[PDB]
């Protein structure tokens, strides 16, 4: 991120602060929770809709002191009224734009938003789990404003959960009770809170939808896989990711020692002494060092992140992931709830600036051996069969004589999103009984309305619909502006929130009351389908054969002689 955009961002932060003052009314309201009363505030949007805002509702004890690295514990109840008229801290993380550490360990909070606290009928509850690679993100309204959803009669809830090493440290020694996945256990405890408390805000605990994008989609899928959450919610939406994506899990049990050493630890590699050191470290020091944790060997083997969701080494009462997510799909309660999945039309455009900084990355397309799924590749990636699989990847994506950056980004869309989606659909068909799954493809490009993640990846002016560009049409943010009612952007906001609300309500994303959806016949994907069909959202809403299908089939062909691994 350039100094020019950093200054522009700081200017936007200040302007947003004063806008939020002008959007705050003097009307406050009290609601009940199982732990005590909370005070919220009525806010306006730039469109002059209004909503009640409760931020900083605790769903767990602050995970500090002896509770660092542990599963969340239920919070202490209070008498009186807890002030929820302002946001709390985000989880400790490196700011995606400023590049300095921010946040606090005191971050286990959720926010609840609704246009009417005493509605005439109990409302669908939509629960958003943010992405950010399990290392960044927040429920702050400068990124995730509820202003578009609250136009309609739903309850919207945005959760936080622990990030980075603080959320995902994992140690083999059973006596230490640090098995991993604390941040996913935070999500579990928040979902239990939502089930138990949403009725106090007008919500229907029998009609909860969990949705999330990127690592939030992997998170939502994990919440559909684990026995810990069986029956807690009723629809799921996986936006650009799932839990069997190769980037969505890692075995990180040996990395706590490495992190401790980077932070000044002088002792030996045993879990007890390593944990003792990490319990005393300042949290900012651990988070700032996370980028250095992966070893030369792990980088060589293309490990994505050092700490993240892991297969837990031993069983505990709160265990979320007892087996690899591919095996968990086989018995998952969430296979039996209505599900919607989708991606954008140029997911890999996300890598534009990375390829500008290091153009030699395109040389990876000469053989493509480094993109072959690890379960199919030999250890050295030199075996003739591995070169043959790489050649199939190359044929799918290299469209001219010499590989290009655009070819690289197209490949990225598939390795990180489309191919894992295909593998999940095919795996899940073998372990479900007719519960429908619906596909969408987000294909609406505008540069009149943008979001902060385009700036974070240095993508202003870059044409195409990249990863996370759809969030602009779901959430208000501090870079947004009021759009005319007749504008293509405004209509896209109405269509996207409208489809998500319709799916959350009924488990079927089609409604003739959504403009442009009248002539849509949106069937779910069947086991017998050889070509997937999806609702493509552009300036129009159209059912189409997934354009990515041919390339998806080319990736699948690598498994022809290894079908047991597909």
Automatic annotation (TrEMBL):
Q: Which key words are in the record?
A: Disulfide bond, Glycoprotein, Hydrolase, Serine esterase
- Hey, which family's this protein in? Belongs to the type-B carboxylesterase/lipase family.
Reply yes or no: does the keyword Disulfide bond apply.
yes
Q: What InterPro entries does UniProt report for this protein, alphabetically?
A: AB_hydrolase_fold, CarbesteraseB, Carboxylesterase_B_AS
Per UniProt, what is one Pfam family of this protein?
A: COesterase
Question: What is this protein's record name?
Answer: Carboxylic ester hydrolase
Q: Which residues carry this modification: N6,N6,N6-trimethyllysine?
A: 151-152, 533
Q: Which GO terms describe its molecular function?
A: carboxylic ester hydrolase activity
Q: Which Gene3D superfamilies match?
A: alpha/beta hydrolase (3.40.50.1820)
N6-methyllysine sites (modified residues)? 6, 17, 37, 39, 70, 88, 195, 282, 302, 330, 356, 395, 491, 527, 533, 553
> SUPFAM superfamilies of this UniProt entry?
alpha/beta-Hydrolases
Which residue range or ranges hold the Carboxylesterase type B domain?
Answer: 30-543
Question: Known EC number(s)?
Answer: 3.1.1.-
Residues annotated as carrying N6,N6-dimethyllysine in the record are: 6, 12, 37, 39, 42, 70, 122, 151, 195, 261, 266, 282, 302, 323, 330, 356, 392, 394, 463, 481, 491, 533, 551, 553, 561
Q: Which domain of life is it from?
A: Eukaryota
């Amino acid at each position: 991120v350039s100094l020019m955009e950093k200054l522009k961002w700081k200017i936007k932060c200040i302007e947003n602060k004063f806008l939020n003052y002008r959007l705050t009314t003097n009307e406050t309201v009290v609601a009940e929770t199982e732990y005590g009363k909370v005070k919220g505030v009525k806010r306006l949007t730039v469109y002059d809709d209004s909503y009640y805002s409760f931020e900083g509702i605790p769903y767990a004890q602050p995970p500090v002191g002896e509770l660092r690295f542990k599963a969340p514990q239920r919070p202490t109840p209070w008498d009186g009224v807890r002030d929820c008229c302002n946001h709390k801290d985000k989880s400790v993380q490196v700011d995606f734009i400023a590049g300095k550490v921010c946040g606090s360990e005191d971050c286990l909070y959720l926010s609840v938003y609704t246009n009417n606290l005493n509605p005439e009928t109990k409302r669908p509850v939509l629960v958003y789990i943010h992405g950010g690679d399990f290392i960044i993100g927040e429920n702050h309204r400068d990124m995730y404003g509820p202003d578009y959803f609250i136009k309609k009669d739903v309850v919207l809830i945005n959760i936080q959960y622990r990030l980075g090493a603080l959320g995902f440290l994992s140690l083999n020694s059973e006596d230490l009770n640090v098995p991993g996945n604390a941040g996913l256990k935070d999500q579990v405890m928040a979902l239990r809170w939502i089930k138990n408390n949403c009725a106090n805000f007008g919500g229907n605990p029998d009609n909860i939808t969990v949705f999330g994008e990127s690592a939030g989609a992997a998170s939502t899928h994990y919440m559909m896989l684990t026995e810990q959450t069986r029956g807690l919610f009723h629809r799921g939406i996986l936006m650009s990711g799932n839990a069997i994506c190769p980037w969505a899990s890692t075995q990180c049990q040996h990395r706590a020692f490495t992190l401790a050493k980077l932070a000044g630890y002088k002792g030996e590699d045993n879990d007890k002494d390593v944990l003792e050191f990490l319990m005393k470290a300042k949290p900012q020091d651990l988070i700032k060092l996370e980028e250095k944790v992966l070893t030369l060997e792990e980088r060589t083997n293309m490990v994505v992140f050092p700490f993240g969701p892991t297969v837990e080494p031993y069983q505990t009462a709160d265990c979320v992931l007892p087996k690899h997510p591919r095996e968990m799909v086989k018995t998952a309660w969430g296979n039996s709830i209505p599900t919607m999945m989708g991606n954008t039309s140029y997911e890999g455009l996300f890598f534009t600036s990375i390829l500008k900084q290091t153009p030699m990355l395109v040389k990876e397309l000469e053989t493509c051996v480094n993109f072959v799924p690890s379960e199919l590749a030999d250890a050295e990636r030199t075996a003739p069969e591995t070169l043959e699989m790489g050649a199939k990847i190359k044929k799918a994506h290299v469209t001219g004589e010499t590989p290009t950056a655009d070819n690289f980004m197209d490949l990225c869309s598939h390795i990180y999103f489309w191919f894992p989606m295909h593998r999940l659909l095919q795996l899940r068909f073998n372990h479900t009984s007719g519960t429908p799954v619906y596909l969408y493809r987000f294909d609406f490009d505008s540069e009149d309305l943008i979001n902060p993640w385009r700036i974070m990846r240095s993508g202003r002016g870059v044409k195409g619909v990249g990863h996370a560009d759809e969030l602009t049409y779901f959430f208000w943010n501090q870079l947004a502006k009021r759009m005319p009612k007749e504008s293509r952007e405004y209509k896209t906001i109405e269509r996207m929130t409208g489809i998500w609300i319709q799916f959350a309500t009924t488990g079927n994303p089609y409604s003739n009351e959504i403009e442009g959806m009248e002539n849509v016949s949106w069937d779910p994907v069947e086991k017998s389908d050889e070509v997937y069909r999806c609702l493509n959202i552009s300036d129009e809403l159209k059912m189409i054969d997934v354009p990515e299908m041919d390339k998806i089939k080319q990736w699948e062909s690598m498994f022809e002689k290894h079908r047991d691994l597909f």
